[PDB]
Design goal:
Layout: E1 9-12, E2 25-32, E3 35-40, E4 45-50, E5 54-56, E6 64-67, E7 76-83, E8 86-91, E9 97-101, E10 105-107
Antiparallel strand pairs: 1-2, 1-5, 2-3, 3-4, 6-7, 6-10, 7-8, 8-9
The structure holds chloride ion and sodium ion (NA).
Chloride ion binds near residues 50 and 53.
Amino acid sequence: GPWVTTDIQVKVRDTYLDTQVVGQTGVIRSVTGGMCSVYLKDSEKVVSISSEHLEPITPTKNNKVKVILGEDREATGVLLSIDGEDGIVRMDLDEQLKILNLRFLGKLLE
Ligand SMILES: [Cl-]
Ligand code: NA
């Protein structure tokens, strides 16, 4: 299913109509029918943007993360380390480490 979810950092792709918004970063704060309300950091404004114009920003070490794909989607944690293509995440619910390919992880900015 979809990857978009609340509170993750995204970049606007070149299928969005407004050239001034293409390439900007923001954070999803709501999702309704495949439209996301994205708070754009540079322009300091919200825009309603179809999910299919977005891409997740890959998290780095010490970012909080929210799983966006697979069985653990919506679970949160902290990215402790990157080993190649895999992230090592301390999961918030049980405090245990879990290995997830980085493509499974959104950067959580609450
Ligand atoms: Cl749109
Ligand atoms: Na969409």
